[PDB]
Amino acid sequence: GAMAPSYRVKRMDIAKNDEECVVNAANPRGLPGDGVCKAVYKKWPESFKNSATPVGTAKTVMCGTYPVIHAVGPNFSNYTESEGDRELAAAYREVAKEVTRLGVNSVAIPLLSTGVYSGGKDRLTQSLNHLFTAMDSTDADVVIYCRDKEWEKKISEAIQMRT
Ligand SMILES: [Cl-]
Ligand SMILES: [Cl-]
Ligand SMILES: [Cl-]
Structure with a gap:
């Protein structure tokens, strides 16, 4: 565990992270995809061997000894608000x-x-809030990665609010 488990947020490419493992915002088919998934594919392509997994689940594949946790959130274009909410909560618990x-x-x-x-x-x-619900009982230092300046401020405020 970390000695004083924390939450932090950084505005940069998650492919340049300084943490012991990465979570990929994966698709269910283990395809290179777009956005975070494509950056992860460019940095850790070896981790896409047999990475396909259903919505609401996470599957870890090692790139060397570096763990890539492929977490499949729901596409809210296809799910109802209710069912999508349940699958999004489940992906984070996994x-x-x-x-x-x-x-x-x-x-x-x-x-x-x-x-x-x-x-x-x-x-x-x-x-x-689903991230917090899942991760609050873990003792890992969590570093949240985002790309938007306004999102960085809102995530930082939500972390500081609870400290
Ligand atoms: Cl960057
Ligand atoms: Cl997404
Ligand atoms: Cl963002």
Whole structure:
């Protein structure tokens, strides 16, 4: 575990993270995809061997000894708000189980279903609150990666609010 487990947020490419493992915002078919998934494919392509996994699940594949946790959030274009919410909560619970199993002291994580799977809605708060629900019982340092300046401020505020 980390000595004083924390949450932090950084505005940069998750492929440049300084953590012991990464969470990919994966598609269910283990394809290179777009956004975070394409950056992860360019940095850790070996981790896409047999990475396909259903919506609401996480599957870890090693790139050398570096763990890539493929977490499949729902595409809110295809799911109802209710069912999508349940699958998005489930994907994060599976990430917490993998982080715990791996024994890492730190993890880099994007906000699942906030990009092209958002169904054109702002899901910062929904996705971040499911992240917290899952990760709060873990003792890993969590570093959240984002690309938007306003999102960085809102994520930083939500972390500081609870400290
Ligand atoms: Cl960058
Ligand atoms: Cl997404
Ligand atoms: Cl963002």
